[PDB]
Amino acid sequence: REVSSLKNKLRRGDLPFVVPRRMARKGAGDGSDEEVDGKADGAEAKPAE
Secondary structure, three states, X not given: OHHHHHHHHXXXXXXXXXXXXXXXXXXXXXXXXXXXXXXXXXXXXXXXX
16 A cells, blocks of 8 residues: 555656746836926925024
């Protein structure tokens, strides 16, 4: 039973294997025309003493 079990393991291929995984694709998507200006207001605080 021990020799038979060892022979069946080699014939079946029982080994510490890992299922492979595929690769992901890049998300290079086209942009939209929703542009915003970089304008900003100025400060109005007074200097300290």
